[PDB]
C-alpha cells in the first residue's frame, strides 16, 4: 500500500501551500512528487472499474471491497483543505517562473484534475484564476505556435507546459460547470483573437513537419470548442447558438478539411471528426444552413 | 450541417481505391486515373481534373520517360487536339481536304489571327507562312512544318537549312558546326525587328537567346510553358562549354520565383504547370492547399505513385506517411478503408516501404482494437475466418502475438482469449479462460442470464475444441470441465430444482456427501488448483441452502428426512475444518438453523 507515500504527499502539500522555497526549484520538486502520487493511486482503470466496485458494494451482499474509492476520498480530503490556498500559490506561480518548473507544475494540475474533478475545485479554482489566466493565454497560444518554431528550443520547455494547458483546458470543458467557467471567459473570443481559425494552414523546416503541427493545435483547440458545447445543453441553450457561430465563421476550413492523407492524415482525420462532431453536437450545422 | 458531401466523396474515393486493390490482387488491368476522370468531369475539379488527364497521358507513358518530352506532348497534343475540334464543326465543311495543315490554316484563318483580316504578318497568297510553321510546330507536326519552309518562298534560306536536321536529328539539332552561325544571324539580322512568328520559329528552333521569351504571340499560359520546354537542351548539354544552356531545374525554379501560383492564373491552372514542370512534390502540395482536399492530394499522389514516381499532413511528402496520416481521420471510425489505403504502400516496391507497410498495419491493428475486423473471427474447427488484413496476408501471427501480450498488460481479457484463439494457442486460451470463468463464479448471487458472456464463453470452447483434436493439457481441460458443471449448477440453482442441484453438486466430487470422510475432503483441498480452491466457499452453503429448503419440514409412509441431513453434517465438519482457508463466512451456520 502506498500508504506511506501518503505522509510525503501531505508534506508536499503543505510547503506548495507555505510558498517557502525561494527556489521555484524545490516547488517543482513538490509538484513532481505529488504528480506521482496523484497517478500512482489511481493506476489506470476507466469508468468500468468504477462501476463494477459500485455493483459489489451492493449492496454489501457480503464482504465488499471499497478501497480504492475511499483511497481517492482521503487523498480528495487532504487536497480541499490545503487547495484554497495552494491553488493560489501554484498558479501564480505558473506563470513565472518558471517557464521551467512549468512543465512540471502544469502536469501536476492536470493530475490532480481528475480527481478532484469534480468538485471542488471547479469551485474554487474557477474563479479565480484561473480562468481569465488561461483564455488570454488561448489567444498567445496561436502567437506561441509561431514563436514555435524559435523557440524549438526552448521548447522543450513549454511542451512540456502548452500540451499540458491545452489539456487542463479540455478537462475543465468535459464537465457542465468547467465548461461554464471557460466559456464565461470568453473562449470563442480568445479562440478568434487568435485567428488560428480563421485562416488556412496550407498556406504557409520540412513542409510535413510543420502541417503536422499546425493541425495538431488545431485538433486540441477544436477538441476543446466541442467539448465545451456538447457539455451545456446543446440544443436550444446559448451554447448551441455558439458553436454554430463558430462553424459558419470558420467555414470553409471544415470543408476543406474533410480530404487527404499522411500522420498529417492522422491528424486531419481527428480534425475532421471532431468537426463532425460539432456539427452534428449543435444544431445541425447541415440542419441550420437549411 | 452534416456534410454528407464529403463522406459520400469519402465513400467514393475509397470505392476506386477499393477496386484498384482487387485489380492488383487479381492482376487487372483497372486504370485508376480513367476512373478518376470519369468523376471528376463534373466541377471545380474542372482543374483536378485536367491534372488527372495530364497523368494519363503519362500512362506507360515512359516510350523511356523523358520529362521535357512528355509535357511538350501533352500540350503540343492539346492543342491539335483543340485544332482539330475547331475544324470539325461547319464551314467551307473546310473546302480541302482534312490533311493537318490545312486543318491548322483553318485555325490560323478562321480563328482569331483575323477579326476582319489583317497585320504585320508575311503572307503570301493569302496565308501567314511564318505563323503556320509556328503553329504547325506547335501542334507537334515537325515535319510539315519543314515542308511549309521548304515551299515558302523566302530569303533567310540559310534557316532553312538549320530547320532541316533538327528535324532530323532527335530534335536537339546539335551540328558542331553551323549554329553559331545561325545565332550572330539572329542577332544581328532578326533580333531587332521582324514579324513576330518568324522571330518565334528562330528562337525556339535555335535557342537562339535565352533570355526568355516571345513578344506577340504568345497567348495563353500553355503556349507559355510550351515555349520554355521547347527551350531547355537536356542532353548533351553539359558537353560544349559556352553558357547558352537552359535547364529544367532552371525552368523550374523560374516557375517557383514569383511565378506563384497567382501568377498562374487561370490560380486553377498552376496545378497543371506543377505536374508539367516535373515539380511532383511540389504538385501534391500544391493540391494540399484550398479544399486542398486532403483527400484529393492523397489520390494524386496515389496516382503518380502507380507511375512509379515518388524517386525521392499539409506539407509531408512520403507517400507511405501520405497515406498513412490520411488514414487517421477515419481510422477508428472505418478500419476497412484504412487497410486499404495502407495497402497502396506497397505499391513503391522495394524493402523499406514494404516494412512501413507492415508497420503502418501492425500500428493500425494496436490501439484501433479492432481486432475482429482487422486480424479474423470464430474458428468452428474452419481456422480463421479471415480478417480484412489476411486476405492481404502474411505476417499476422507475430502481429497477434504482440497484441495478445499488450492485452495481457492492459488486462484487456477477452481479447486476449480472442487473440490467442488465432494464434492457436489452445493450452493459453483455456487457461486464461478458467481464470476467468473461475473468478465471477466466486462471488455474490443473481446473475447469469442463459445467453451471453464469461459462462457462455466457456461453452463456446469447450464445445469448440475438445472435440477436436484438443492440444489442450487434460489438466487444463479438467478444470474447465469442472468450472462448467458448477456453473450449470447454478442455473439451475435457484429457477427451483432443488432436488436436482444436490444432485449435480455430489457429481463433483468435491464435497463430502457421504460419511464423516469430510476430511479426506480436507487431505483433497490444498492439492486442488488455485482456481477451484477458490470456488469452494459457494459450493458449500449452495449446498446448505437447497438442503435447507428441500428438508423444509413437510406437513403430515417413506420420508428419509436423515439424508439431505447427515449431508448438512458432514458439510459443516468440512466448513469447519477449512474456514481459515476460507474467505471467512461460516455464514452457513446462518442457514443451517431456523
Known sequence: ?290 | PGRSSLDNIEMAYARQIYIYNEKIVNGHLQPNLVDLCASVAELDDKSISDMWTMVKQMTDVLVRMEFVRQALAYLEQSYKNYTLVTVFGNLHQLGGVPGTYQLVRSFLNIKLPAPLPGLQDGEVEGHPVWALIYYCMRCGDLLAASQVVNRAQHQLGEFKTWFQEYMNSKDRRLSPATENKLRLHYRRALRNNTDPYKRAVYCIIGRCDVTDNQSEVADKTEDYLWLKLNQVCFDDDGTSSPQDRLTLSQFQKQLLEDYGESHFTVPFLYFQVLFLTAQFEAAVAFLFRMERLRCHAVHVALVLFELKLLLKCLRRLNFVRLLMLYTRKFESTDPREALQYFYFLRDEKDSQGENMFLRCVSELVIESREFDMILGKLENDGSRKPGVIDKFTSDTKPIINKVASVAENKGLFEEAAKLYDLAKNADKVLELMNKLLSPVVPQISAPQSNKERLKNMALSIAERYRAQGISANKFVDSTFYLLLDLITFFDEYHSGHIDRAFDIIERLKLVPLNQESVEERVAAFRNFSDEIRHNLSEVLLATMNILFTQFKRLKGIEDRDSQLRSQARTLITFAGMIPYRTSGDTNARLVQME
Not at chain 1, 16 to 29: A, C, D, P
Open chain 1, 1 to 290: 500500500g502506498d500508504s506511506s507515500l501518503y505522509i510525503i504527499l501531505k508534506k508536499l502539500l503543505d510547503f506548495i501551500l507555505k510558498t517557502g522555497g525561494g527556489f521555484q526549484r524545490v516547488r517543482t520538486h513538490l509538484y513532481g512528487s505529488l504528480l506521482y502520487y496523484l497517478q500512482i493511486a489511481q493506476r489506470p482503470d476507466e469508468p468500468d472499474t468504477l462501476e463494477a466496485a459500485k455493483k459489489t458494494m451492493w449492496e454489501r451482499l457480503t464482504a465488499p471491497e471499497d478501497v480504492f474509492s475511499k483511497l481517492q476520498r482521503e487523498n480528495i480530503a487532504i487536497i480541499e483543505s490545503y487547495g484554497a490556498a495552494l491553488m493560489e500559490v501554484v498558479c501564480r506561480d505558473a506563470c513565472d517562473g518558471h517557464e521551467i518548473g512549468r512543465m512540471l507544475a502544469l502536469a501536476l494540475l492536470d493530475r490532480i484534475v481528475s480527481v478532484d474533478k469534480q468538485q471542488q475545485w471547479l469551485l474554487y479554482l474557477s474563479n479565480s484564476g484561473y480562468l481569465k489566466v488561461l483564455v488570454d493565454s488561448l489567444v498567445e497560444d496561436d502567437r506561441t505556435l509561431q514563436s514555435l518554431l524559435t523557440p524549438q528550443p526552448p521548447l522543450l520547455k513549454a511542451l512540456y507546459t502548452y500540451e499540458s494547458k491545452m489539456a487542463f483546458l479540455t478537462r475543465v470543458a468535459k464537465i457542465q460547470q468547467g465548461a461554464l467557467e471557460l466559456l464565461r471567459s470568453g473562449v470563442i473570443v480568445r479562440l478568434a483573437q487568435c485567428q488560428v481559425y480563421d485562416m488556412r494552414p496550407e498556406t504557409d523546416m520540412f513542409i510535413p513537419t510543420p502541417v503536422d503541427r499546425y493541425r495538431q493545435i488545431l485538433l486540441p483547440a477544436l477538441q476543446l470548442c466541442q467539448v465545451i458545447l456538447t457539455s451545456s445543453m446543446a440544443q436550444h441553450l446559448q451554447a448551441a447558438g455558439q458553436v454554430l457561430q463558430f462553424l459558419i465563421s470558420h467555414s470553409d476550413t471544415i470543408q476543406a478539411i474533410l480530404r487527404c492523407q499522411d500522420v498529417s492524415a492522422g491528424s486531419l482525420q481527428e480534425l475532421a471528426l471532431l468537426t463532425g462532431i460539432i456539427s452534428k453536437a449543435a444544431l445541425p450545422g447541415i440542419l441550420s444552413e437549411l
